[PDB]
């Protein structure tokens, strides 16, 4: 055996650092993942706050560049694509096109994530007797408002930038999967292919890609596991 | 008269753009400032979605460079500094130094923007009878949470990345304000030098700057105007 290049530290639940599992594995890129244990209070002890001192994950070692260590989930994508995607099979070389990836991941990374989580509190994740579904409402119709940009952009453009796949779609794809299946399904009348064709195109072609399909199927599995 | 360099289209209350506005004035360059009325919905025209397709504020148009568009105001601060901040007066020439900058940008985009906001939402923002500060608690402890967490650095580090201001530093600079002065402010004995005297220290610091503090008195200006 020898020693993977990254390790990855994900959760079985959370969307976030499944972003970065996919890049990893559409790239062919090795790595171990660690579970870090937000139940034990895992990711606030001073074992991981060491890497991450938000104290959330997820958070990426590279222990082939001296362990260097990165944390944020869509700078991680970044890092990932500025130092191992020299052919830009995921990423963009012009400064023109660099700046628009970056403002998608920065629209994913404060428009998705934290409204779609918002959703996901409310909803489904805070403790039972705390879940809400009448505050929900304001970020289940958040997500629909997301949709909708995204829905007038996509309608226009086969992919976010440069008319061809980069980390700003990948990073995407776990929240609107997320979204479609659980904070929005049922909802007012939900039909994502009905309701938001052109986003409902996008997401069914990245979520049929081998490596994506992967790290989804990697993902049912690793929380069915917690259960054995 | 000379058509300044770009347009910046901001709001008097909305914290976001001035963040940029302080970019701006830091590097001494030339700009008009749009004020987008939110209460027409004017973010939501077509006139304004020709720009950003999300319909917020920020959204800048470089017009020396073929009036080139970006929206995301941390994407915008990085606009800012790789076209005209040669000399790294705000920012870093490094890869290491570039993705770890980048790093905090994004969990000041995810972590503080978002949060600090459904405080000031519940709290202050929102119309008056939908205000509400039992949800609003959940992210006023979130704000003190962000703040343990900067504490936690700046307590050994004198800025965010590379031991020099950059936009790291800059990015959360309005919303930090805006809680001390507001979201905060007389939640739980909250005493900002006494409770995060590192993130009191270096707050401070970024705001007695004087292109800073020009754009803080600035905006209080705006907002006073508003009723005029
Ligand atoms: N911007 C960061 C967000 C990372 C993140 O949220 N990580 C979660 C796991 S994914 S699970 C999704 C996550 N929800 C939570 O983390 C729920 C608990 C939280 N403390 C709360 O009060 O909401 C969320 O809403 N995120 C908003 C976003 O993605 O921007 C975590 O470590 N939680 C441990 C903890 O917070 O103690 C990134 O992209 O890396
Ligand atoms: N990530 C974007 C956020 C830009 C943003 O929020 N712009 C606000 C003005 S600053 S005002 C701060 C803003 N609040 C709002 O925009 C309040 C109304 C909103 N639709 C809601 O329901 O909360 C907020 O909480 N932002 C979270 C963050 O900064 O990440 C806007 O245009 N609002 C018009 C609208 O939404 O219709 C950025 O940094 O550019």
Same mark, same amino acid.
């Given at each position: 055996?020898?020693?993977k290049q990254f390790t &990855?530290?994900?959760?079985?639940?959370?969307?976030?650092?499944?972003?970065?599992?996919?890049?990893?594995?559409? &790239?062919?890129?090795?790595?171990?993942?660690?579970?870090?244990?937000?139940?034990?209070?895992?990711?606030?002890?001073?074992?991981?706050?060491?890497?991450?001192?938000?104290?959330?994950?997820?958070?990426?070692?590279?222990?082939?560049?001296?362990?260097?260590?990165?944390?944020?989930s869509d700078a991680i994508?970044?890092?990932?694509?500025?130092?191992?995607?020299?052919?830009?099979?995921?990423?963009?070389?012009?400064?023109?096109?660099?700046?628009?990836?970056?403002?998608?991941?920065?629209?994913?990374?404060?428009?998705?994530?934290?409204?779609?989580?918002?959703?996901?509190?409310?909803?489904?994740?805070?403790?039972?007797?705390?879940?809400?579904?009448?505050?929900?409402?304001?970020?289940?119709?958040?997500?629909?408002?997301?949709?909708?940009?995204?829905?007038?952009?996509?309608?226009?453009?086969?992919?976010?930038?440069?008319?061809?796949?980069?980390?700003?779609?990948?990073?995407?794809?776990?929240?609107?999967?997320?979204?479609?299946?659980?904070?929005?399904?049922?909802?007012?009348g939900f039909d994502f292919?009905?309701?938001?064709?052109?986003?409902?195109?996008?997401?069914?072609?990245?979520?049929?890609?081998?490596?994506?399909?992967?790290?989804?199927?990697?993902?049912?599995?690793?929380?069915?596991?917690?259960?054995?």
């Amino acid at each position: 055996s020898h020693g993977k290049q990254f390790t &990855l530290f994900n959760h079985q639940v959370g969307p976030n650092g499944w972003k970065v599992d996919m890049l990893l594995r559409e &790239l062919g890129l090795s790595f171990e993942t660690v579970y870090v244990n937000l139940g034990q209070r895992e990711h606030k002890s001073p074992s991981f706050t060491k890497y991450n001192p938000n104290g959330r994950i997820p958070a990426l070692i590279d222990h082939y560049y001296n362990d260097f260590v990165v944390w944020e989930s869509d700078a991680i994508l970044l890092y990932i694509v500025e130092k191992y995607d020299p052919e830009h099979k995921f990423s963009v070389s012009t400064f023109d096109d660099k700046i628009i990836m970056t403002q998608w991941l920065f629209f994913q990374a404060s428009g998705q994530g934290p409204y779609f989580g918002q959703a996901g509190w409310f909803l489904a994740v805070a403790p039972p007797e705390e879940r809400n579904p009448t505050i929900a409402e304001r970020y289940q119709k958040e997500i629909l408002r997301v949709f909708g940009v995204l829905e007038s952009v996509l309608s226009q453009r086969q992919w976010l930038v440069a008319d061809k796949l980069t980390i700003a779609d990948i990073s995407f794809v776990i929240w609107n999967a997320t979204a479609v299946n659980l904070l929005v399904k049922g909802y007012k009348g939900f039909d994502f292919e009905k309701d938001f064709p052109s986003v409902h195109r996008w997401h069914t072609a990245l979520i049929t890609r081998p490596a994506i399909a992967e790290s989804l199927k990697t993902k049912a599995e690793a929380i069915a596991q917690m259960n054995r």
